[PDB]
């Protein structure tokens, strides 16, 4: 008792209610943003599936909304080639390009999962704080029933009542927490697969155009000129 | 894995038995 | 009266909600199990027959010819057409290793998409298997709160009045558990079968890519060797 | 009433059914224990014997001959035949690097396949050990709600009336956990054993690949330095 | 990594039993 | 006793032991939280500043020039210093790919070590919050056994004396729990933040690696090709 | 007869059985902790001195000359003689890239086997810490079943006839828990220590592989350059 038994109870209660409303609003925001990004990447993938060289892909991406990792990576590979700048190490160029693309898509996927661990810990710790509330309430109830020794237990009712109320609040904060956490894991896995697909697509485009340009220019220039002038 | 749900059922069993203790 | 089925008659404000939630969960997990199991069993029989048919390939053209008469939704022929259009786009490109890397990444993305398609409801299976006991406990503690407010607002030492509330609470609990256990066991068996199916598709992908590499490298070796070592050192 | 062996009637019919289910699950898990343990110890002895045989393996023909005299139903002979026939098929080719790449790919694919074929029942044991506590608590709550509805339909004030159903719940939990514990024990044990087996088969596969690289470099470097530089570089 | 799921059930059960035995009726 | 804090210096030896253990665990978790949080904030601020300063890199020498002004307690500084001394050691050779891959591997190992020593207290708080409920549970069950043997000595069927003992037991439980929850939540926070920080270190490592590759390629390709072409095809 | 020195007297079959099991678990985990951790810290001092001596090793022959007088079980000696015998095997070969690849493969296999042998008991500690609460729960359910049998076959409201039974039951629970606690805490701390040791041996393996690659490049570069350049660029 000592008048400081329910203060922690109401504190953890409002903590759970604020955690739940934070989960709800982050669900709203992240769902809106991720569905918008999914539709955007779907449309742009459908548009870029008809690409042959990097020129057409770039001239089509410049018309899209620049808030897309696709065009970012496209111009990034273009800048990486421009930085290569007359270096005949096409293999190393492709390797550095792929490594940069992988690092960028990994960073983007990491930025995507904001509240993942948040909801994880929330749903993990809400039952534990519920148990803490229950044990403290039943302890105060035992102290009261010891101060007034009797078989009638009509006084334990409010204590266990608020204890199981805090427990139920923990459950109604954890269940949505965990289900939304799993839904978010699934949708970010889908988005990661999609951005990996588009990264493989742009890398395949880069490699294909580079090999196309290098094939004839190598089998016609270095071959004949030097193998007759050597 | 999920062998936790014994807590609430056991505690409410405790409560109902202790309140049926008088009658 | 208060049997396992006799709940929609004696439901309450939270009792009816948890009851309809758990019966919906059980129905959806049952239909998911049945549909996905039948579909995947038939698909796996078809894929086994197709792999048995293509297990004796010799070249790319021969493999495509023998697989032309396969099913339309044939992942094997899908990969063959993928490799073929990759070669078509790589026409006039004397970079074997680049084509190999491109084809490998393409088969990787294909099998990833196939795993995503097959592993599409397993996420929901895990979710329901995790939450069904928890929502059962939620309904249970709500019933406990209802019984407690009834006791506090009507203080009577009647031993019979305390029975039905706790009974319905534990019955909703048991409904949650009987929705949970099938969910997780089907999730596990589906994980096993999807592991087997992904191993099979990885095997056939390895087969087609190794056949591609073999024939391309043989042709390249022969032609490059003869031409280069017979022409361009006497032509200098 | 004499013991657990004599309390098979005062419970629910579904309680006895799920109890017999737990008993048969424990029996089949012990049977899988014995069978898989015998098979894994046989495979371990075979692996150690084959490794001791190939301890000085430095020639493909020598390795194949020293492995064929033992039990030919061994993964070692399978991998040896695989590498040999792959070299035979891709022979008269100059893709030595691609040779090693494709060979190692096929070897690791077959190793993953064989490892999957080894660790099969481990998943079943995992599912059993996971669901046994869940079905135990399910029988528990079912028995307790049956007892509560029986007390509700009746009117009992004594303290000894709740004994039979609660005791049935206790024995159900006991069966569930005595099925659960050995399940996870053997699961982790077999996990360790298949990890060691995978390590050993990877060691022998790396040995085959090392011998292949050795012999191919021996056949390539000498012939190139003695013939390739002298073939046409003199007539330039 | 987790914390635990088992240990609380022990005290829940033992408190349940001590209460049901200390029950006078 | 009747006072929550009355029975702390008496009638509790093992209970006082576990209480001191859990309070020491809580305060050590708090001080590790404070120290590691300050350290990671400083580290991430310095890393962000250095990244925005080096984002305009063109070659390794300019990177070293812009980096010399960094604080001596800069992990990026020691990474680029390791890269520079590795390049110095590998100098006087032409194994471009070999040099870049060996520096890449050494950088991977160095950043792994830096992440494992920076994120050191993670497992500390993990095991602390894991064992805190364990020792609390040991304390409460020991108190329960003490109360039970006391009632066995003097057969008390009342509830008065039963209350304070079990009350102190649940006090030990609650103390262990309120020591565990902060431990596990700050452990999760530290895990996430060190994952982000090691990801940033991976980004700067990829930056310096691509810089090395680019500068090596640009310094080698044109110069080597034209000079050796001229030299050995006018002298060959 | 209530404490551990007297509970075994009136202990039942399963009581004394699980008690012996848990005390054997406690002593076996304590002995494993002592022996394995002592061996690991001694090997840690050994490898610390090793890498301290190798910090000034900037060649191959100097590394071998320093390793000539290492400890009787120096892992660095194992890796160095492995590299040496691998060079001996794949000698007379100018395709050193495949030599480096096979060296890396053999080294990763060797360090994997070494990490398996070093942490050869961590899985056992994990299993013990996982199943000890489960055998504790087995004790709980068996004791509660026995107490309910005693209270059911004796349909009396007495309390002193069952108090010692439930007391011994909760005593079994407490001893199972106090056997679980040291197992799990020792497993966690030992896992941290063995992860540090594995990181250190990974550092030394990266060091020896870096040294091997660097010395191979240094020995091949200038010689191959001058010889091939002169001969097959002036005689062409």
Automatic annotation (TrEMBL), chain B:
Signal peptide: none annotated. It comes from the Bacteria. It is found in: Cell inner membrane; Cell membrane. The chain crosses the membrane at residues 3-23. Belongs to the ExbD/TolR family. The accessory proteins ExbB and ExbD seem to form a complex with TonB. Involved in the TonB-dependent energy-dependent transport of various receptor-bound substrates. This is Biopolymer transport protein ExbD. The gene is exbD. The chain holds residues 18 to 40 of 140 of the full protein.
């Amino acid at each position: 008792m000592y008048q400081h038994a329910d203060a922690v109870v109401k504190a953890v209660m409002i903590g759970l209610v604020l955690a739940s409303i934070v989960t709800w609003t982050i669900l709203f925001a992240k769902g809106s943003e991720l569905l918008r990004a999914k539709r955007r990447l779907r449309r742009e993938q459908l548009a870029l599936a008809e690409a042959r060289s990097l020129d057409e892909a770039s001239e089509l991406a410049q018309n899209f909304s620049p808030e897309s990792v696709s065009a970012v990576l496209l111009n990034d590979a273009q800048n990486e080639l421009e930085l290569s700048a007359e270096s005949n190490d096409n293999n190393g160029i492709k390797e550095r390009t792929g490594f940069r693309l992988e690092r960028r898509v990994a960073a983007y996927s990491r930025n995507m999962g904001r509240g993942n661990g948040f909801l994880a810990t929330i749903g993990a710790i809400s039952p534990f704080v519920g148990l803490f509330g229950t044990v403290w309430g039943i302890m105060n109830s035992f102290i009261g029933i010891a101060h007034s020794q009797t078989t009638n237990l009509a006084v334990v009712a409010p204590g266990i009542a608020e204890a199981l109320l805090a427990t139920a609040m923990g459950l109604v904060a954890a269940i949505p927490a965990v289900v939304i956490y799993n839904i978010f894991a699934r949708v970010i896995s889908g988005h990661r697969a999609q951005v990996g697909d588009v990264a493989a697509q742009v890398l395949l485009l880069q490699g294909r155009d580079l090999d196309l340009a290098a094939t004839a220019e190598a089998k016609r220039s270095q071959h004949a000129h030097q193998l007759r002038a050597g | 894995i999920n062998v936790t749900p014994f807590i609430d059922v056991m505690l409410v069993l405790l409560i109902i038995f202790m309140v049926a203790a008088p009658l």
